[PDB]
Design an enzyme around this catalytic site. Sequence first.
Site, PDB file in Angstrom:
ATOM      1  N   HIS A  48       4.084  17.203  16.809  1.00 18.98           N
ATOM      2  CA  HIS A  48       3.763  16.254  18.063  1.00 18.98           C
ATOM      3  C   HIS A  48       3.874  17.345  19.286  1.00 18.98           C
ATOM      4  CE1 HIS A  48       4.316  13.662  21.303  1.00 18.98           C
ATOM      5  NE2 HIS A  48       5.775  14.279  21.577  1.00 18.98           N
ATOM      6  N   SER A 105      -2.448  17.573  16.604  1.00 19.20           N
ATOM      7  CA  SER A 105      -3.248  17.825  15.258  1.00 19.20           C
ATOM      8  C   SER A 105      -4.387  18.771  15.611  1.00 19.20           C
ATOM      9  CB  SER A 105      -3.612  16.474  14.358  1.00 19.20           C
ATOM     10  OG  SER A 105      -2.241  15.835  13.789  1.00 19.20           O
ATOM     11  N   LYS A 162      -7.391   3.869   9.293  1.00 20.93           N
ATOM     12  CA  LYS A 162      -7.675   4.964   8.533  1.00 20.93           C
ATOM     13  C   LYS A 162      -6.638   5.374   7.299  1.00 20.93           C
ATOM     14  CE  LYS A 162     -10.633   9.080   9.202  1.00 20.93           C
ATOM     15  NZ  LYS A 162     -11.781   8.496   9.306  1.00 20.93           N
ATOM     16  N   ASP A 163      -5.372   5.287   7.876  1.00 19.41           N
ATOM     17  CA  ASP A 163      -4.130   5.591   6.912  1.00 19.41           C
ATOM     18  C   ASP A 163      -3.974   4.189   6.113  1.00 19.41           C
ATOM     19  OD1 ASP A 163      -3.650   8.123   7.890  1.00 19.41           O
ATOM     20  OD2 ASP A 163      -2.390   7.219   9.670  1.00 19.41           O
ATOM     21  N   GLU A 174       8.027  19.813 -16.114  1.00 20.14           N
ATOM     22  CA  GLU A 174       6.959  18.879 -15.707  1.00 20.14           C
ATOM     23  C   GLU A 174       5.801  19.719 -14.926  1.00 20.14           C
ATOM     24  OE1 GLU A 174       8.989  16.123 -13.030  1.00 20.14           O
ATOM     25  OE2 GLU A 174       7.220  14.661 -13.175  1.00 20.14           O
TER      26      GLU A 174
HETATM   27  C1  HEM Z   1       7.736  15.643   2.420  1.00 25.22           C
HETATM   28  C2  HEM Z   1       6.473  15.961   2.679  1.00 25.22           C
HETATM   29  C3  HEM Z   1       5.605  16.147   3.809  1.00 25.22           C
HETATM   30  C4  HEM Z   1       5.432  15.404   4.849  1.00 25.22           C
HETATM   31  C5  HEM Z   1       6.018  13.730   5.025  1.00 25.22           C
HETATM   32  C6  HEM Z   1       4.539  15.701   5.901  1.00 25.22           C
HETATM   33  C7  HEM Z   1       4.221  15.006   6.902  1.00 25.22           C
HETATM   34  C8  HEM Z   1       3.072  15.550   8.090  1.00 25.22           C
HETATM   35  C9  HEM Z   1       2.324  14.611   8.482  1.00 25.22           C
HETATM   36  C10 HEM Z   1       2.364  12.868   8.844  1.00 25.22           C
HETATM   37  C11 HEM Z   1       1.381  15.199   9.352  1.00 25.22           C
HETATM   38  C12 HEM Z   1       0.523  14.747  10.187  1.00 25.22           C
HETATM   39  C13 HEM Z   1      -0.738  14.324   9.423  1.00 25.22           C
HETATM   40  C14 HEM Z   1      -1.583  15.507   9.531  1.00 25.22           C
HETATM   41  O1  HEM Z   1      -1.821  16.203  10.462  1.00 25.22           O
HETATM   42  O2  HEM Z   1      -2.173  15.784   8.407  1.00 25.22           O
HETATM   43  C15 HEM Z   1       1.700  16.669   8.789  1.00 25.22           C
HETATM   44  C16 HEM Z   1       0.873  17.779   9.208  1.00 25.22           C
HETATM   45  C17 HEM Z   1       1.004  18.932   8.732  1.00 25.22           C
HETATM   46  N1  HEM Z   1       1.757  19.273   7.580  1.00 25.22           N
HETATM   47 FE1  HEM Z   1       3.037  18.289   6.524  1.00 25.22          FE
HETATM   48  N2  HEM Z   1       4.160  16.920   5.413  1.00 25.22           N
HETATM   49  C18 HEM Z   1       4.869  17.239   4.322  1.00 25.22           C
HETATM   50  C19 HEM Z   1       4.769  18.483   3.878  1.00 25.22           C
HETATM   51  C20 HEM Z   1       4.183  19.568   4.191  1.00 25.22           C
HETATM   52  C21 HEM Z   1       3.952  20.772   3.618  1.00 25.22           C
HETATM   53  C22 HEM Z   1       4.683  21.229   2.064  1.00 25.22           C
HETATM   54  C23 HEM Z   1       3.313  21.765   4.485  1.00 25.22           C
HETATM   55  C24 HEM Z   1       2.921  22.957   4.018  1.00 25.22           C
HETATM   56  C25 HEM Z   1       3.522  24.118   3.807  1.00 25.22           C
HETATM   57  C26 HEM Z   1       2.826  21.134   5.330  1.00 25.22           C
HETATM   58  C27 HEM Z   1       2.359  21.316   6.640  1.00 25.22           C
HETATM   59  C28 HEM Z   1       1.608  20.720   7.676  1.00 25.22           C
HETATM   60  C29 HEM Z   1       0.420  21.171   8.483  1.00 25.22           C
HETATM   61  C30 HEM Z   1       0.248  22.444   8.634  1.00 25.22           C
HETATM   62  C31 HEM Z   1       0.299  19.898   9.302  1.00 25.22           C
HETATM   63  C32 HEM Z   1      -0.784  20.015  10.356  1.00 25.22           C
HETATM   64  C33 HEM Z   1      -2.153  19.779   9.670  1.00 25.22           C
HETATM   65  C34 HEM Z   1      -3.013  19.694  10.909  1.00 25.22           C
HETATM   66  O3  HEM Z   1      -2.877  19.099  11.910  1.00 25.22           O
HETATM   67  O4  HEM Z   1      -4.148  20.242  10.843  1.00 25.22           O
HETATM   68  N3  HEM Z   1       3.736  19.652   5.488  1.00 25.22           N
HETATM   69  N4  HEM Z   1       2.703  16.655   8.068  1.00 25.22           N
HETATM   70  C1  HEM Z   2      12.352  13.526  -3.045  1.00 25.26           C
HETATM   71  C2  HEM Z   2      11.971  12.291  -3.647  1.00 25.26           C
HETATM   72  C3  HEM Z   2      12.234  12.297  -5.169  1.00 25.26           C
HETATM   73  C4  HEM Z   2      11.563  12.858  -6.159  1.00 25.26           C
HETATM   74  C5  HEM Z   2      10.528  13.580  -5.970  1.00 25.26           C
HETATM   75  C6  HEM Z   2      12.350  12.483  -7.356  1.00 25.26           C
HETATM   76  C7  HEM Z   2      11.906  12.958  -8.850  1.00 25.26           C
HETATM   77  C8  HEM Z   2      12.429  12.492  -9.725  1.00 25.26           C
HETATM   78  C9  HEM Z   2      12.026  12.698 -11.106  1.00 25.26           C
HETATM   79  C10 HEM Z   2      10.685  13.533 -11.477  1.00 25.26           C
HETATM   80  C11 HEM Z   2      12.653  12.291 -12.024  1.00 25.26           C
HETATM   81  C12 HEM Z   2      12.571  12.265 -13.519  1.00 25.26           C
HETATM   82  C13 HEM Z   2      11.994  10.930 -14.140  1.00 25.26           C
HETATM   83  C14 HEM Z   2      11.584  11.201 -15.589  1.00 25.26           C
HETATM   84  O1  HEM Z   2      12.858  10.914 -16.275  1.00 25.26           O
HETATM   85  O2  HEM Z   2      10.517  11.432 -15.926  1.00 25.26           O
HETATM   86  C15 HEM Z   2      13.774  11.704 -11.309  1.00 25.26           C
HETATM   87  C16 HEM Z   2      15.076  10.991 -11.823  1.00 25.26           C
HETATM   88  C17 HEM Z   2      15.768  10.278 -10.916  1.00 25.26           C
HETATM   89  N1  HEM Z   2      15.752  10.256 -10.012  1.00 25.26           N
HETATM   90 FE1  HEM Z   2      14.551  10.808  -8.591  1.00 25.26          FE
HETATM   91  N2  HEM Z   2      13.341  11.547  -7.028  1.00 25.26           N
HETATM   92  C18 HEM Z   2      13.335  11.434  -5.925  1.00 25.26           C
HETATM   93  C19 HEM Z   2      14.400  10.735  -5.036  1.00 25.26           C
HETATM   94  C20 HEM Z   2      15.344   9.999  -5.764  1.00 25.26           C
HETATM   95  C21 HEM Z   2      16.473   9.699  -4.842  1.00 25.26           C
HETATM   96  C22 HEM Z   2      16.553   9.811  -3.486  1.00 25.26           C
HETATM   97  C23 HEM Z   2      17.120   8.911  -5.851  1.00 25.26           C
HETATM   98  C24 HEM Z   2      18.432   8.285  -5.558  1.00 25.26           C
HETATM   99  C25 HEM Z   2      18.897   7.484  -4.711  1.00 25.26           C
HETATM  100  C26 HEM Z   2      16.757   9.286  -7.187  1.00 25.26           C
HETATM  101  C27 HEM Z   2      17.085   8.651  -8.275  1.00 25.26           C
HETATM  102  C28 HEM Z   2      16.709   9.197  -9.459  1.00 25.26           C
HETATM  103  C29 HEM Z   2      17.578   8.528 -10.888  1.00 25.26           C
HETATM  104  C30 HEM Z   2      18.803   7.881 -10.796  1.00 25.26           C
HETATM  105  C31 HEM Z   2      16.988   9.403 -11.712  1.00 25.26           C
HETATM  106  C32 HEM Z   2      17.217   9.224 -13.163  1.00 25.26           C
HETATM  107  C33 HEM Z   2      16.387   8.903 -14.421  1.00 25.26           C
HETATM  108  C34 HEM Z   2      15.614   7.719 -14.233  1.00 25.26           C
HETATM  109  O3  HEM Z   2      16.292   6.428 -14.354  1.00 25.26           O
HETATM  110  O4  HEM Z   2      14.069   7.706 -14.098  1.00 25.26           O
HETATM  111  N3  HEM Z   2      15.643   9.939  -6.911  1.00 25.26           N
HETATM  112  N4  HEM Z   2      13.565  11.888  -9.921  1.00 25.26           N
END
Ligand code: HEM
Ligand code: HEM
Lengths: 385, 385, 247, 126, 57, 93, 93
Positions: free
Chosen positions: B202, B206, B228-229, B272
């Site tokens: 911000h 963007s 759009k979103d 995975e």
């Molecule tokens: C939890 C995951 C993430 C969330 C919620 C998130 C959220 C956002 C949002 C809402 C925007 C503004 C929308 C847009 O510009 O496309 C943004 C922009 C951006 N994010 Fe992320 N993001 C995440 C992960 C990442 C990752 C993994 C990268 C790469 C390292 C990244 C790099 C960027 C960049 C470079 C922008 C600017 C894009 C532009 O303005 O051209 N973000 N992100």
């Molecule tokens: C960052 C976001 C998260 C990701 C990417 C994520 C991803 C995963 C994945 C891939 C599994 C395995 C599912 C499988 O067995 O195939 C898992 C299991 C699980 N996750 Fe998460 N998780 C997230 C957030 C959370 C959070 C915040 C909680 C707790 C409040 C949670 C609770 C669990 C539990 C209880 C399991 C146990 C296996 C099941 O019942 O599916 N997850 N998670």
Amino acid sequence: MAFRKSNVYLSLVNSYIIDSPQPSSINYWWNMGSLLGLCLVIQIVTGIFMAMHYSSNIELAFSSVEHIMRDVHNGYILRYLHANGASFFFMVMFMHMAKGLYYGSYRSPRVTLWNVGVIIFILTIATAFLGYCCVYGQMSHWGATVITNLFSAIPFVGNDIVSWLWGGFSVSNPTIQRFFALHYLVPFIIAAMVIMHLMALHIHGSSNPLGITGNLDRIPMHSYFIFKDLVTVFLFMLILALFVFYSPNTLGHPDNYIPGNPLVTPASIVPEWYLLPFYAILRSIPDKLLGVITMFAAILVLLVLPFTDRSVVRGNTFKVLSKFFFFIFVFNFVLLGQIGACHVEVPYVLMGQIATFIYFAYFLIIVPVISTIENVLFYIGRVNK
Amino acid sequence: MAFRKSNVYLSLVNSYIIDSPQPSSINYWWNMGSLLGLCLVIQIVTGIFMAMHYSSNIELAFSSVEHIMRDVHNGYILRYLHANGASFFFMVMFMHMAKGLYYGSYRSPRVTLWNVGVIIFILTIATAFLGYCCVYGQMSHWGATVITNLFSAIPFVGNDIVSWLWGGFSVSNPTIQRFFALHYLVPFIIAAMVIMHLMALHIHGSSNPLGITGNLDRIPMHSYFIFKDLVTVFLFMLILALFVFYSPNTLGHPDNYIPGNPLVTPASIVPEWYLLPFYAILRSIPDKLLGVITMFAAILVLLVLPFTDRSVVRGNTFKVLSKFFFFIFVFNFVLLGQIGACHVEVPYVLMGQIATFIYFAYFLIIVPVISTIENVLFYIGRVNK
Amino acid sequence: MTAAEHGLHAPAYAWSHNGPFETFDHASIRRGYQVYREVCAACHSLDRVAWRTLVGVSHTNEEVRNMAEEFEYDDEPDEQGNPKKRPGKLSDYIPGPYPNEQAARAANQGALPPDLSLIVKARHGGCDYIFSLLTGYPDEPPAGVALPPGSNYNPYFPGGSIAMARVLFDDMVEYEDGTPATTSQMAKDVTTFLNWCAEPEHDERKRLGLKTVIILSSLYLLSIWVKKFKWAGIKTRKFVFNPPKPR
Amino acid sequence: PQSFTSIARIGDYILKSPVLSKLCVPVANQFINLAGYKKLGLKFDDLIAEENPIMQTALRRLPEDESYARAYRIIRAHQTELTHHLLPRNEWIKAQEDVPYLLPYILEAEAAAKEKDELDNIEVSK
Amino acid sequence: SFSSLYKTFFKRNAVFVGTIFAGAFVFQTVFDTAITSWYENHNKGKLWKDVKARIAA
Amino acid sequence: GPPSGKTYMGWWGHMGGPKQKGITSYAVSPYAQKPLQGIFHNAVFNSFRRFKSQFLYVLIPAGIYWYWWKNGNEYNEFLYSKAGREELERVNV
Amino acid sequence: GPPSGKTYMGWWGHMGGPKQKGITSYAVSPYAQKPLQGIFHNAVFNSFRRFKSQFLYVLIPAGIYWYWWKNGNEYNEFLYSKAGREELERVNV
Ligand code: HEM
Ligand code: HEM
Ligand code: HEC
Ligand code: HEM
Ligand code: HEM
């Protein structure tokens, strides 16, 4: 300009904890917020390092807590820091709220700060109750089922809500797993609410113990008030280290170490001591739905306190009658917490009813009358007509 | 002024999602961030409503998961939403990163944004690994012990830190309780890192898919980009509802449904599918010390990309060889994910080594050479001297 | 690895529940429970399936309450303290044939017969693999392969040699309604029952899926329309630049 | 990221030697008309990133007519990329009017900042 | 006669969200009953009620 | 950024206070001063001044509520003895 | 509040862009327009234009990597066959 003012995260940290202009005359009561933030971080850290070993079944809850107490390295330290830092958290929070409603910081420019604080108070009472019902002792299980059987007094909807909340028909394995998930979850809502508290404060600045404007000569936060906070942090750590290491169980009830058996009742089902005034407000009136709604009114009747104060001077520093009646209210709150620990007996039921009436009449009846009286007294003592 | 610009929290939501001046030229690739925020809160909500029923022992983990699959009302929906929304989270995150390193949003005014995004990517890989290792199947336990057994390759402190991380001597009950506590805890660090991501965005705005400046013609966020979103949110909900309801187990491995027995090795310990390019990078070179630091450098080699690209024009929208080599790199990443799923065999080891050399040479060797070539090509084609 | 250590890939059979709108054949679930009770209950456990899931699906409530009486379960001990046994009710799980893992290994020459409650969900191929593995025993192993004694040949098993002998023969059971019991009919019925045991939420899941994809597809089309409506003021704006007069 | 003095030096050496010129400028012309920034109605010196201090001073030193024509070309490119079309055949930037107009200001601004950078790292003979 | 429909349905927001909620009620109950009747008529010969009536008859 | 609504506290330089003129403020660096200057004089005398000015407002309500609690507690201990069982029934109903 | 460092994007009114003059912008309200205007023409013509302009950069590297993957997979399936065991041990040791 400087890098601590240019970079976006460092500009926030700068504007909040480095050169945030605090008023020049604030005393040691304004450090309770820094103490509450430190103790919240303490609770979260020791809770994570206990939840790495705590298993939340019905066959393994109390056994896992006493496995933390006996076999994991320095686990007695972690459990006593959690169970005593919760009590110290609520005592410093009570000091924070009493400072806020003594020095008149519910008044006209920070009513949204006061409302966000009341939201924080509700949320931490909730997660403190859930944490007390995670451990599954004899006070724990029966306190849970007493206040959910209290919660089932809603006329049309109550049994359906309470058997949705229990996850069954009584407090059992789904209730304990539910309460562990919620006891983890709610402090990460309190962290966001404390960020909201800090924003709603920072837009207007802190009050001073005089009522008058702090905007004339202020003081930066970094080299002075961080060290005042350091003094009170080391004092709070010393008292907490005493209550953790030399007498850990002198605060909690000596019945929570009996494993939770849903057949026997321990003849005294008092909760932990910070819920004792609200439990006395609950047990005051004999009906049950009226009891739970007057407990909720006792909680959120701090919201009528900005709108009911008719004093034109901010704070009870230069007032006499309201000083006297405020300390009447504080010792009435302490007496109410004392009454909540005894059985419903011969002077205790009448003392609880009179004490909750004085509690409800300090906010509604006593304070606009004495504030109006003090305003008129100040005017007719000052002017000579 | 208006109440959405006067009141504090309404000022923050106004300045972030109501009248945030977005550039006018952004296509449907800019909606992946809104999609990532929605999918993160979807993962958090379904995770809390599963952790209300999940019990984190080792003789109760897999049976509690398949008690969620069979006994709780509408719980198969919850587990399939979690286990497939994690995969959709990673694919939308890969599209977010591919857009961010295609359109040149690693460039000079938002390297803070790119580095905080890489930090969120690391934390997301970590919590997806912990969540895959808390369900305790056969792929889960063996993937956990293979990852930490190659984490014991550090020469002086390797066995010390790996038996500190196990909480024992192999993957067992303390490791599973530890992994459930961390699988809660890391997403609530990811949420604060997303707040920092949004702040670092911000303060500079963007980008747009042209590279030219956007300060001339801009559009507020509310009545246009919210819709759009909303279009792409309903499209993603359609694809996620398809993959949850009609074919849930077509994304996961069909060996996580065998209960975890540390005496049988399932003859290939593929993780995975989104950790498969990094698994192929990890199994590229034979020794595991250089292997684990080559996987770590493959993750934190996105940080070299701002200091490396030498083209004066932002983004590969108006270039030729950079588009060609970018799509070479993207299909190389897909081939690396394919090689990560097959055994250690005769073309596969050499193809994995060549594929990770091309993956490492796109960021260090290929992009400055072709960007320099395109810079001087633009200049000598434009200037007639 | 080689194809023998990979296992032969099971073909794509035409099941009665392959489809976005088709459900389980519940007569096949009933017949498959009869085949499991009379044939596979000597070795294989099935202990994540309660008796109460079985009503309303394959048998009725009186039939499952009459079938649960034939097994004994551990009741909590009486006034003296010595343990008692009780006939089963609808809340208890289906009992396994072996009291532990060591008797299960001793009664089957070392090979532990796996739990069948999630066996078409934890195998590559699923019901096609289970059906073709049941019907895929040749009368002789191919010329050249050598097996350890007591181990039988099955090409769809990964490895070549399974430790489970060919059990599905003709007319092993007789059905309650009059369908002929071949080896393929019994195999198809028992793997449809195993698919019900591995996913009991199949019918409800596909019905809620039909609801959700209809609602979300119509919502996607309406949101496309309202996006084009809200953006029609931006897609058709025109810019006109006359060059300004110099100072 | 790359200084325009270096790009100008390599480009001048490629240009004014006749062996490399007749081999390098036809593929450069084909790369430019394959890039497709002229179909949106843009000169090249709008495409350069404007978030360096060198480019910011080189834009604030631009004359008042070319600044307004530059802003119009950028806004028109934004709009015809928004509608996912191209500009028609009359409104394409022709190759003879793709003149470098920002490049003398960029070269002299980077020469001034470069001379400041090596004047304040100077050492007298000791 | 479109001013009639606009004045009685779309003029103030209260009648708008009121008829949206009433349509949500009616649409959702008739939609779920219609889709479950179609899902239980597409499979005739396979459901539990039909095989129970079959083994009774 | 967005300039939000004005409050009663700005930042350093424009704090929103009243304009002041002629208020000279002298100070001395702590390295030139002695900390713990007069801690025993202000520990005996000033602490007694503050305790003398602000103890009636604390001790009169504490005295009232403590006497009420002690009288109620000793009345309850009287009633659940043997010399108050007729009074126990009379207070019950 | 504290005025932090300069950015390349202001707010509404002072966006930090260059000054513009003489760029008139006409637009019509969508209630006066038709949505879904010419979506078939721009569905089968403009989409074909964009696909024709942007398919070589996608379908040359995908073709290269898919041919490499198919050649490697078929070479592996040949080497773990019956007619490739001596070449298997030759390429191993
Ligand atoms: C939890 C995951 C993430 C969330 C919620 C998130 C959220 C956002 C949002 C809402 C925007 C503004 C929308 C847009 O510009 O496309 C943004 C922009 C951006 N994010 Fe992320 N993001 C995440 C992960 C990442 C990752 C993994 C990268 C790469 C390292 C990244 C790099 C960027 C960049 C470079 C922008 C600017 C894009 C532009 O303005 O051209 N973000 N992100
Ligand atoms: C960052 C976001 C998260 C990701 C990417 C994520 C991803 C995963 C994945 C891939 C599994 C395995 C599912 C499988 O067995 O195939 C898992 C299991 C699980 N996750 Fe998460 N998780 C997230 C957030 C959370 C959070 C915040 C909680 C707790 C409040 C949670 C609770 C669990 C539990 C209880 C399991 C146990 C296996 C099941 O019942 O599916 N997850 N998670
Ligand atoms: C013993 C008297 C058995 C009877 C009757 C049946 N099975 Fe069996 N089975 C048995 C053993 C000892 C083993 C272990 C063999 C091994 O090497 O694992 C098995 C194995 C299975 C498997 C697993 C195959 C795999 O790839 O993992 C399945 C799916 C299986 N058995 C199913 C099955 C069915 C459906 C039967 C009757 C209708 C049946 N078995 C009979 C022992 C015995
Ligand atoms: C708002 C801050 C918190 C408060 C006030 C609080 C309070 C409490 C209290 C009073 C108990 C009961 C202790 C006892 O048995 O006497 C408890 C238990 C527990 N709390 Fe918390 N808690 C807080 C935050 C957390 C968090 C965030 C976690 C998780 C990371 C956590 C983990 C636990 C666990 C595991 C127990 C189980 C019993 C034990 O070992 O003490 N706490 N909590
Ligand atoms: C998690 C608990 C809390 C934390 C961390 C917290 C934090 C803070 C902090 C750091 C301050 C600034 C320091 C100060 O002025 O004292 C503050 C001020 C304040 N807090 Fe809290 N607080 C908490 C709970 C509450 C509660 C429960 C209330 C009352 C309902 C409240 C009301 C106030 C008020 C009124 C102020 C302003 C005091 C003044 O400026 O005069 N807070 N808080």
